[PDB]
Structure formats: C-alpha cells, structure tokens
Amino acid sequence: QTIQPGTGYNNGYFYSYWNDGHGGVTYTNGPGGQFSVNWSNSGNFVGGKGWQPGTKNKVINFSGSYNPNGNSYLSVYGWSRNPLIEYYIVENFGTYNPSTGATKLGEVTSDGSVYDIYRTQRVNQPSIIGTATFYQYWSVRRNHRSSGSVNTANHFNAWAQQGLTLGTMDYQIVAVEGYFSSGSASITVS
Template sequence: MKKQNPLTSATRKVAFGAAAIVVLAGATILTGCKKEEKTQPDVAGIERPSKAVTETYQSGTHNGFFWSLWQSDGATGTVNYANGPGGNYSVNWNGFNGNFTCGKGYSAGSPSYKIGYNLGTYSNSGGGTFGWYGWSRNPYYEYYVNETWGAVSPHTGTYLGTFESDGAGYNVWTRWMTGKNIDGGDGFRQIYSSRVNKVSTGQNHVITFANHYNKWSSLGYTLGQLNIPAIMVSETWGSNTNGNINCTIWMQ
C-alpha cells in the first residue's frame, strides 16, 4: 500500500476511472491494496464480474473508529461516503456499476466483540450485504455476520445449519474461493452467518460475535489471527445500482 498525505480539508474528492467517490473524513488515505473479485452467478438481472480486477482501498481513523472504503477498478457512477459523529457513517450511490464496500469499526478484530448498532436507513438495489465483516490469517478466512442484504440473497455455498444468537435465527454457510487472499496468496475460505429474517431499521441491535465464532469453530471452521481491521460493512455490487445507508455502531 502507498500511504498518501493526510487530508487537508473535511472534503476530498477522489476519481477512480469514470467513478467519482466523495469521502467526508479528516483521515489518512491508504491506496493500492488489491483483493480478488469474488464470483457470483447472474441473479435477477444483476451481473457480478467473474475475473480478477485491480481495486482501490482507502482507510483511516475517525473519532476513535477505524473506517475504510474499497471499490473495484473500472467502476462507473457516483459513491458518497461520510463519517459522522462517533460510530456513525453514511453512504449513498447512484448509477453505480461495479463493487464497493465501506464502513466503520476497529483496527483489529476480536472473538470477544459485542457490537451494538442502529441501522437508521437501508436501501440497496444491487447485491451485497450489511453486517459485521473482517478477515483472519493462518488460516485465511473472510467472515461475515449478515444482518440484511440488497436485491440478491447472499446464501450461496454449503449450508451448515441454523442457530440462534441475540434473539435471532442465523443460517451458516461456507465456500472456498479460488481468488487472492488479503496478502496476495491463492485461495481463502468464506464463512458467514446470515439472519433468517432481515434486521429492522431504526432500532438498536446487538451482534455478540463470540456466538458466531464459537458456532463456526464447532463446525470445524476456526478463524485464525484476527489482528486485521473489522467493520460494520455496507456493500453493493451489480449494474446501475442505487442505494442509501446510514448506520451507527458502538461497543456494548
């Protein structure tokens, strides 16, 4: 990653190809990380890219929280990301073609995290999910706790059963990915819990991550080192997608 100078004003506009991304944050920007694009079959008229692409990654700290914004190269359309007070952030996008993720969280993951959050607004005409997200090393896992999702269901791979956490039912899925992991090596595993019923907006909710970590471990999928940032992620992918998300997180 190539580290750039800190932002000198509250607003900085960064252009990636034909896509314009507006970041509202007084934070250091990191660029140049690469991650393999995941593959997904066409569903409901939404096509996800099936080849590896160069991607752009930005991250920093804001009010004690880690934040990041990632998007695939060659994307078109407009994405507006803003860091609000405390653990709040918002993102809206129009006519977006490609894949992006963004969110606020912490500079390292932990199996003991208990995350409170309020999803004030959620609309997403594309694919992609909203929930707790991160990576582990040794072994390489990309993990999700999916609280809600856009127009396309995230339920793919091998179904491993259902369990209850924080008063909600979750389905567990896993699949092996042949793309590049976060360190540029070949292959990694996805593991995720996905709510049986999508979360409601405008109410306080909790994710007790230990419940998911322990459930995955009991099924033979134990995460590795978690000294990698973890965020409450907002994601979209697809063609000509539009959406608006506002979220606030805190540590319980």
C-alpha cells in the same frame, strides 16, 4: 468527510472504504461511529467502520437505516489470518442472498433470530495478503434488520463447533457492500 477509497481512523474507529473504480458511490465518515453511503448504479464497493484488530468476543451495536435497490449486504465483516478467512455476519441484504448455492454448515440462534451458517471458497482472489485461495464463512440472519446488537462470540463459537476455525483477527467492521446496484445507508456503530 467525504473521501476517496482508503483506510484510517476517524473519531476513534477504524474505517475502510474500497471500490472498483466504476463510479457511482459516495462514502462519508460522520461523527463517532457514524458513516453514510449513497450509491447510484455503482460497481462493487465495501465501506464501513469498526475496529483493527477485531476480537473474538466483541458485542457490536449498530443503528440506522439501510435502503438497497439491488444487490447489497449489511454485515459484520472482517478477516482472520493464519488461516486466512473472510467472514460475514449478514444482517440484511437486497435482491441476492449471498448464501445462494453455498454449503450449509449449521444454524445458530443469536440476538433474536436464527442464522444459517455457510462456507464457500474463493480461488485466486484478492485478499488482505495478496492474491490467494481462502475460505469465506457466513452467518445469514433469517429476520432482516438495520439496527441491533451482534454477539460475535455466538457466531465464532458455532463456526468452531462445525469445524470452521478462525486464526488471528484482522479488521472487523460493520459494512455496507454493493455490487452494481443503488441505495442509501446511514449507520452508527459502537
């Protein structure tokens, strides 16, 4: 169904949908691992389906279409605790490469492309445990796509080799994020 922001389970998958209250986004849960997002002159939002908790060796499959017009990402997205880390495995994006200005910490080859690895810091920003300062880890795919398989262990192991360690996993979703943009997406996770 079409829903207001929140979290829960839908057809055996965890979902999360958040927005900043600006307007312009419609999130719909579909059957099984499916969700759709349609947005028009949105604010900031994130929505998707996956698992709570995630794991460090999940192979995540996703299939569908992703058509941003402006600033948006399509990623495997999640958190760890202790240490608190927000992470992204970015499969596709719109007008903005989210690694712009950020410190490159290596490369990893996985699932048919090279990914560039980055770390950034968020200072006194909202998090799963309240306002905090924490790092963000990124793998950014060079060859953009809207279907595929992501072997998360390849990323998490590469990160660890470079000194980017993860704690206890919290949620782990395939997410569409937007920042004051428009677009449509329909994705099925498994």
